[PDB]
Design a protein around this ligand. Structure first.
Ligand SMILES: *Cc1c(COP(=O)(O)O)cnc(C)c1O
Ligand SMILES: *Cc1c(COP(=O)(O)O)cnc(C)c1O
Ligand SMILES: O=C(O)[C@@H](O)Cc1c[nH]c2ccccc12
Ligand SMILES: [Mg+2]
Ligand SMILES: [Mg+2]
Lengths: 398, 388
């Protein structure tokens, strides 16, 4: 009956968290999952979230179904963050937006929409990409391919090879792009590079699906959203999935959004209706709590401002560890370049360590990373940094 | 939803004495959605201290899963002691149905699903959303006001091995009309005989008789050693529609087959939404696995159960005081918050335009919309349309 069902190998990222918790080392360090940890080494509750949550709890409200699209303020908050407050596209009523179960739920709903309305469309993800990108899209019965992205030889982007790749594709083929803070390489495109990319997307009439999960961790909110906002300004059929998991430090509550930028108000209504309908088929409506937190924080002027402040402090703390690590690494190893540490953006960096070197760090030192050498920089702090440096140089000499 | 056109017609009605019985939500005596005291206590515990918010395991919280398992199958049911049930926390019962269907589609691609005539609207949409061919088995008989039982079994016999039946264990939506224990016993015997897959969808456990009775069809199917899928929802019994709390349980012949299935359930969650929501999971975890809170919760559910039966009684007694030839026992014979009132689509219309009392044109009424300040208004309005 069930003997035919295959064993599930386990999620590489989420299985690793349990190996970390199950490990009983004094100096254990988790650079595996894309979570931000404070200077103390613990996952913070943002102050703005704390105020918001005290509001929700005072008093305790009845809990009806949210609209399928989630809360108006949650939707507005997604939109204003991605496109800009008072953006003409928003004022023209041209973006259809739903609350989703994290960035993951946004990717699902989006891909399902794409599958249904563009059944011949093939999706293409970065080489490499965040693993779950492939799983979500194939889950909708869409054929998934890679586009050359990361120059595994140089630690930069195979830009020409990538561009030449996008010229070969079919109309309405879907590119799954990282607007900023690449997962897992940390290697982003320059503005100028985005311009050329987005020019090709137009000429070839491909569908951009931008997946953004670390807005505010790269440069700043508006700057990180460049690729999104440019695409809008060019008039492209845009899909955006956004996540508040990371910048609201609210991973567990499953907060995200999906926005579809449309040619007309009436097409917006149609797509929005379709989005609502896709949601109905998957989970009916999104969770209330996470929704309210997003709503309350995004649309309270003082909380929004405080939140922006808190995201940048996170961004700054990550950036300072990049340079603190680079400097203590620099001194210990002569024969190697460490420029990638301060050149990459976001929570992640490709260290360029072999799967073996990654696993020696795990076994001997209790330092956790993905086998592809991805390191979550956020797990570093002034306590563990001399320890991780010392460990890295000990695995690099060997 | 088709309900949303009705909700739109209802808001469009200016009648100040209007009543919405087309709702699919429990209201208390004051005609509002209640916050349960056990939920209120739970959420006060979650609020102090505000705790960091890691991802949940893709399966949800251990306690959420254990909660679902003990509620469905019985505290220390052998099937649990034997570890023969794969259980994940889900985005309500909706998300439980989704994971279930996609699972079935991936591994039993040839399987067709059959839902009751009639059923909860989304049953069809969810399974059709997975590229499963969905049909209807006969259930409700308009002529008797009960179950086309013989015809239903007859339909079940014509179905292939591994075909899926969507079965309401109790408190049938939208009719209120339930199978007896005897009727269940033969159903599960047909299902076993034909090696069909029982998919049971339980959203109103505790609104029918009690927790254990409501779960009869579930627990028997386990005793018989059937390949049972269960989707359960706390939306209603926990009054937590918006936090999206349910479970999906799959009962397997072997400990090893459970690990395989539990594995794919996880892999399915991974492709849809990565992991379920922290808050709702915690409320379920606290309320199910705190002994006193569990008792209080059970009590509060039975208070709702009893309020529904209190309104079913009052309505019938007003009706029977005026009409003699009909047997209204079916109003009290039905269970949960839904009632096929057996009014003609024309009679439903009459109630709308004359009284602003809103039912679904298939005679469906949500009994929980009745409270002491509209019961007499609504009962009397009904006598008029039946007298016309
Ligand atoms: C972490 C991540 C996600 C997942 O976001 P959730 O809010 O957890 O669903 C999606 N895309 C990328 C690129 C990510 O890094
Ligand atoms: C309400 C209901 C569901 C779905 O419950 P949710 O928790 O809101 O997803 C499923 N089946 C039936 C019969 C229902 O009444
Ligand atoms: O990128 C990271 O570091 C994580 O956010 C990924 C991640 C977190 N939870 C998951 C569940 C399934 C698949 C991937 C994930
Ligand atoms: Mg599908
Ligand atoms: Mg507000």
């Amino acid at each position: 009956m069930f003997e035919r069902i295959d064993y599930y190998a386990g999620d590489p990222i989420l299985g690793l968290v349990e190996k970390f918790a199950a490990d009983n080392n004094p100096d254990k360090v988790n650079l595996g999952i894309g979570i931000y940890y404070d200077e103390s080494g613990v996952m913070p509750v943002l102050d703005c979230v704390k105020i918001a949550e005290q509001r929700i709890a005072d008093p305790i409200s009845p809990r009806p179904y949210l609209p399928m699209a989630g809360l108006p303020g949650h939707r507005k908050g997604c939109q204003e963050l991605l496109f800009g407050k008072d953006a003409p596209v928003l004022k023209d009523g041209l973006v259809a937006t739903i609350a989703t179960i994290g960035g993951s739920g946004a990717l699902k709903v989006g891909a399902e929409f794409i599958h249904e309305w563009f059944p011949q469309s093939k999706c293409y993800v970065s080489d490499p990409t965040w693993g779950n990108h492939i799983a979500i899209f194939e889950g909708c019965d869409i054929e998934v391919g890679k586009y050359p992205y990361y120059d595994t030889a140089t630690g930069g982007i195979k830009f020409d090879e990538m561009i030449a790749f996008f010229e070969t594709l079919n109309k309405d083929d879907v590119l799954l792009l990282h607007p900023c803070c690449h997962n897992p390489t940390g290697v982003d495109l320059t503005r100028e590079q985005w311009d050329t990319v987005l020019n090709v997307i137009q000429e070839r009439e491909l569908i951009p699906f931008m997946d953004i999960a670390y807005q505010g961790f790269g440069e700043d909110m508006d700057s990180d959203a460049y690729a999104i906002r440019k695409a809008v300004d060019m008039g492209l059929p845009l899909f955006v999935s956004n996540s508040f998991s990371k910048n609201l430090s609210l991973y567990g509550e499953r907060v995200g959004g999906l926005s579809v930028v449309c040619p007309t108000v009436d097409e917006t209504e149609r797509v929005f209706g379709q989005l609502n309908s896709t949601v109905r088929r998957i989970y009916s409506s999104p969770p209330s709590h996470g929704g309210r937190v997003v709503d309350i924080v995004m649309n309270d002027a003082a909380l929004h401002e405080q939140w922006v402040g808190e995201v940048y402090a996170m961004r700054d703390r990550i950036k300072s560890m990049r340079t603190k690590l680079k400097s203590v690494l620099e001194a210990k190893i002569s024969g190697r370049n460490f420029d990638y540490l301060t050149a990459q953006n976001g929570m992640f960096s490709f260290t360029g360590l072999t799967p073996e070197q990654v696993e020696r760090l795990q076994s001997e030192f209790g330092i956790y990373m993905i086998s592809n050498s991805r390191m979550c920089v956020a797990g570093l702090n002034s306590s563990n940094i001399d320890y991780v440096a010392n460990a890295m140089v000990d695995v690099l000499k060997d």
